[PDB]
Structure 1
């Protein structure tokens, strides 16, 4: 089954998921000088005040903090989007070293990690239907650099000991994802895909210009997680990122000059 190792990693995925070589794959390099300012792009509207987190899960490729998406409680609107997208989960991708870990790159620069806040278009009724549509998901991507701690991340870091291995979950209620956002909501946007199998081409990517800083101790704790299940040989969950894919017939738009 797919993963991030030498024998089942990103270079292999196309054999089970041929869309890996498709026309709108993610992530991509964001060439800041070639991105086009679009003065008609609207500000993002991030409405997370009524967010209801439920659970945190190690799924063997990352950890997901899951939300109640059975009502419009935490929604993303505006920006390049038409309509309303509901927050279902967030997760991260990260490296074995501080100089790698992000999926998107900026002028070929890699960040230590990348946060994905995953939302689905409510006109499609459920997440499973949404991923089958070209405008089904909106993923808000936020870069992490190592420096000062992010206080709003700490509750996530503190629970990781309880979900060390694949298939473990823990209650994770009353977490406020607003504490993970940078000051600015300036962004780049382009049409792309899920960055893990099934690699479906259903995502409007919205990548924030401003990274958040996290501490070395915070990201070290991410790196103590395991890809494996309990009782299986230990394989540290690190380098769970897909590299940049060809841009092909796409232009990245910027909300800012």
Structure 2
């Protein structure tokens, strides 16, 4: 599976029939239809003890991985019941600044989208959590192109060392707090992984406020390769799934 004409999102359902399921992601967020849910509890993003370990080009994106062997970096509150542990983050981005996000907002595409992936500790490990309807919480953050995000530059600067699929590099001491916007206002809905295996195990929490990154920062994302070393170069761009049918779901807002 990949993002090309012959193996991209329109093909995924043949190997992964849940691609046509009842709670697939991403979705378009219609901001006028989303309803404030006065009942949602405050959201709690607690990343002070986050322990990054490694960055990996997996052929689909690059993942910054964390040590999730203890409650260090956790997401709580909001729509969530219990505690969700950060395991990795990654991005989806475009070939041009006018596309790249997975979620859209009133059909607007952002230049990229950051996914901070967390698993519900009540299920013990990530592989068990993805088999549960409430196994994961993904915090999604839009990227627009404008001012540079200083907290992103350490990620940007290591990408030269993981250009191709299967390459990894040590990436300790990276603070994901530097990737968050000021506001934690969000939309939330029940959905899925946005790549195979497309499992319907995710509570999505999508922040309303984008972060700004510079054109130079995102241009370096676009120099990565989908291919492995020594193979014909295929730039890693447009690694996003388009919006999927909302079906029987409501998107809730944390704000008025």
| Both proteins in one fold, TM over 0.5 | yes
State the Cα distance separating 1:42 from its structure 2 match: 1.3
- In the aligned structure 2, how far is the partner of 1:33 from the partner of 1:42? 22
Deviations 1:65-92 (A, max 9, x none): 0000000000000000000000000000
- In the aligned structure 1, how far is the partner of 2:213 from the partner of 2:174? 18
Equivalent residue for 1:31?
30
- In the aligned structure 1, how far is the partner of 2:82 from the partner of 2:69? 17
Q: Give the secondary structure class of the aligned counterpart of 2:195.
A: coil
Deviations 1:15-58 (A, max 9, x none): 00000000000000000000010011112100000000000000
- In the aligned structure 2, how far is the partner of 1:233 from the partner of 1:67? 31
State the Cα distance separating 1:218 from its structure 2 match: 0.1
Deviations 1:116-168 (A, max 9, x none): 00000000000000000000000000000000000000000000000000000
Matched, 1:158 2:157: yes
State the Cα distance separating 1:201 from its structure 2 match: 0.1
- In the aligned structure 2, how far is the partner of 1:123 from the partner of 1:233? 44
**Number of matched pairs:** 256
Q: Give the secondary structure class of the aligned counterpart of 1:217.
A: helix
State the Cα distance separating 1:97 from its structure 2 match: 0.2
Matched, 1:238 2:234: no
- In the aligned structure 1, how far is the partner of 2:43 from the partner of 2:177? 14
Q: Give the secondary structure class of the aligned counterpart of 1:141.
A: strand
TM-score, normalised to structure 2, is 1.00
Where do 4+ consecutive residues of structure 1 move more than 3 Å? none
- In the aligned structure 2, how far is the partner of 1:103 from the partner of 1:42? 26
- In the aligned structure 2, how far is the partner of 1:123 from the partner of 1:90? 21
Deviations 1:194-235 (A, max 9, x none): 000000000000000000000000000000000000001000
- In the aligned structure 1, how far is the partner of 2:72 from the partner of 2:227? 33
Q: Give the secondary structure class of the aligned counterpart of 1:154.
A: helix
Q: Give the secondary structure class of the aligned counterpart of 2:87.
A: strand
Q: Give the secondary structure class of the aligned counterpart of 2:139.
A: strand
- In the aligned structure 2, how far is the partner of 1:231 from the partner of 1:204? 39
- Structure 1, unmatched stretches of 5+, are none
Q: Give the secondary structure class of the aligned counterpart of 2:153.
A: helix
- In the aligned structure 2, how far is the partner of 1:216 from the partner of 1:250? 35
- In the aligned structure 2, how far is the partner of 1:208 from the partner of 1:7? 33
Q: Give the secondary structure class of the aligned counterpart of 1:77.
A: strand
State the Cα distance separating 1:14 from its structure 2 match: 0.1
- In the aligned structure 2, how far is the partner of 1:158 from the partner of 1:213? 17
- Structure 2, unmatched stretches of 5+, are none
- In the aligned structure 2, how far is the partner of 1:192 from the partner of 1:154? 31
TM-score, normalised to structure 1, is 0.99
